[PDB]
Design a protein around this motif. Structure first.
Motif, short mmCIF file in Angstrom:
data_model
loop_
_atom_site.label_atom_id
_atom_site.label_comp_id
_atom_site.label_asym_id
_atom_site.label_seq_id
_atom_site.Cartn_x
_atom_site.Cartn_y
_atom_site.Cartn_z
N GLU A 1 -43.09 19.00 -7.73
CA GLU A 1 -42.00 19.87 -8.18
C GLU A 1 -42.43 21.34 -8.18
OE1 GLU A 1 -41.54 17.52 -11.84
OE2 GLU A 1 -39.53 18.33 -11.84
N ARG A 2 -43.66 21.58 -8.60
CA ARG A 2 -44.16 22.94 -8.72
C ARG A 2 -44.34 23.58 -7.35
NH1 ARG A 2 -49.23 22.79 -12.64
NH2 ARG A 2 -49.13 25.05 -12.22
N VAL A 3 -44.90 22.83 -6.41
CA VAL A 3 -45.21 23.41 -5.10
C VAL A 3 -43.91 23.58 -4.28
CG1 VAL A 3 -45.70 21.37 -3.71
CG2 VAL A 3 -46.93 23.51 -3.27
N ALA A 4 -42.90 22.76 -4.56
CA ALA A 4 -41.61 22.92 -3.91
C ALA A 4 -40.98 24.30 -4.16
CB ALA A 4 -40.66 21.83 -4.34
N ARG A 5 -41.41 24.96 -5.22
CA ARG A 5 -40.90 26.28 -5.59
C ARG A 5 -41.54 27.42 -4.80
NH1 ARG A 5 -38.46 26.72 -10.53
NH2 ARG A 5 -38.30 24.81 -11.78
N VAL A 6 -42.72 27.17 -4.21
CA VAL A 6 -43.57 28.23 -3.64
C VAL A 6 -43.31 28.36 -2.15
CG1 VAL A 6 -45.96 28.94 -3.24
CG2 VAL A 6 -45.32 27.72 -5.36
N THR A 7 -43.06 29.58 -1.70
CA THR A 7 -42.73 29.80 -0.29
C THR A 7 -43.56 30.88 0.39
OG1 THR A 7 -40.88 31.33 -0.74
CG2 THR A 7 -40.34 28.96 -0.59
N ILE A 8 -44.67 31.26 -0.25
CA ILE A 8 -45.49 32.37 0.22
C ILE A 8 -46.03 32.14 1.64
CG2 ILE A 8 -47.71 33.52 -0.19
CD1 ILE A 8 -47.05 33.23 -3.23
N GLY A 9 -46.48 30.93 1.93
CA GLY A 9 -46.98 30.59 3.25
C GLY A 9 -47.57 29.20 3.25
N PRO A 10 -47.76 28.62 4.44
CA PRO A 10 -48.21 27.23 4.48
C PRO A 10 -49.61 27.00 3.94
CG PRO A 10 -48.00 28.15 6.67
CD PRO A 10 -47.35 29.11 5.77
N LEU A 11 -50.54 27.93 4.15
CA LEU A 11 -51.89 27.75 3.59
C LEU A 11 -51.87 27.90 2.07
CD1 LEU A 11 -54.18 29.47 6.22
CD2 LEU A 11 -53.68 27.04 6.01
N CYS A 12 -51.10 28.87 1.58
CA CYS A 12 -50.92 29.04 0.14
C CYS A 12 -50.34 27.77 -0.51
CB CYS A 12 -50.02 30.25 -0.15
SG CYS A 12 -49.57 30.44 -1.90
N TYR B 1 -61.32 27.68 1.07
CA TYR B 1 -60.31 28.51 1.69
C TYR B 1 -60.95 29.84 2.07
CZ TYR B 1 -57.43 24.90 -0.47
OH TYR B 1 -56.91 23.67 -0.82
N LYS B 2 -60.66 30.32 3.28
CA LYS B 2 -61.30 31.52 3.78
C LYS B 2 -60.85 32.79 3.06
CE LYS B 2 -62.02 34.26 7.98
NZ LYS B 2 -61.91 34.29 9.46
N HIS B 3 -59.55 32.93 2.87
CA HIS B 3 -58.99 34.20 2.39
C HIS B 3 -58.55 34.19 0.93
CE1 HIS B 3 -58.57 35.31 6.76
NE2 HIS B 3 -59.18 36.34 6.21
N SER B 4 -58.39 35.39 0.40
CA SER B 4 -58.14 35.57 -1.02
C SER B 4 -56.81 35.00 -1.48
CB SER B 4 -58.18 37.06 -1.37
OG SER B 4 -59.50 37.53 -1.34
N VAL B 5 -55.75 35.14 -0.68
CA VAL B 5 -54.43 34.71 -1.17
C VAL B 5 -54.42 33.18 -1.39
CG1 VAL B 5 -51.96 34.52 -0.65
CG2 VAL B 5 -53.10 36.74 -0.53
N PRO B 6 -54.88 32.38 -0.41
CA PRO B 6 -54.91 30.95 -0.71
C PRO B 6 -55.81 30.57 -1.89
CG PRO B 6 -54.83 31.27 1.64
CD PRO B 6 -55.03 32.64 1.03
N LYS B 7 -56.91 31.29 -2.09
CA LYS B 7 -57.74 31.04 -3.27
C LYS B 7 -56.92 31.27 -4.53
CE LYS B 7 -62.01 32.53 -1.01
NZ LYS B 7 -62.83 31.31 -1.09
N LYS B 8 -56.17 32.36 -4.58
CA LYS B 8 -55.31 32.64 -5.75
C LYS B 8 -54.22 31.58 -5.92
CE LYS B 8 -56.26 37.57 -5.76
NZ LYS B 8 -55.73 38.92 -5.48
N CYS B 9 -53.61 31.15 -4.83
CA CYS B 9 -52.62 30.07 -4.86
C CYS B 9 -53.24 28.80 -5.45
CB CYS B 9 -52.10 29.80 -3.47
SG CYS B 9 -51.22 31.20 -2.78
N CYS B 10 -54.48 28.50 -5.09
CA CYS B 10 -55.19 27.36 -5.66
C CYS B 10 -55.33 27.54 -7.17
CB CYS B 10 -56.56 27.23 -4.99
SG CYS B 10 -57.77 26.22 -5.87
N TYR B 11 -55.83 28.69 -7.60
CA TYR B 11 -56.00 28.92 -9.03
C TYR B 11 -54.65 28.80 -9.75
CZ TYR B 11 -60.53 30.89 -7.68
OH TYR B 11 -61.79 31.08 -7.16
#
Length: 70
Positions: free
Chosen positions: A41-52, A18-28
């Motif tokens: 179930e877990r990812v259904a909760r997350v709405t930060i952005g499509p790459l995240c 992943y290029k940018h920091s936010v998606p890297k953090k989303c991965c972690y």
């Protein structure tokens, strides 16, 4: 128990794609243990952005597979 070295290494490898920091953090974050919900179930909760969301789900999937292959 599960091979934690391995889990850390595989998540680091995926995060590097992943290029940018936010998606890297989303991965972690997706890779962190959750005893009560599946990755879907877990990812259904997350709405930060499509790459995240993609990163969270992919890393969750990688981590949980390593946990179950203990």
């Amino acid at each position: 128990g599960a091979n934690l070295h391995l889990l850390r290494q595989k998540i680091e490898e995926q995060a590097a794609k992943y290029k940018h920091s936010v998606p890297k953090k989303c991965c972690y974050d997706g890779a962190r243990v959750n005893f009560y919900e599946t990755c879907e179930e877990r990812v259904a909760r997350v709405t930060i952005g499509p790459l995240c969301i993609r990163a969270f789900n992919e890393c969750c999937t990688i981590a949980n597979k390593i946990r179950k292959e203990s």
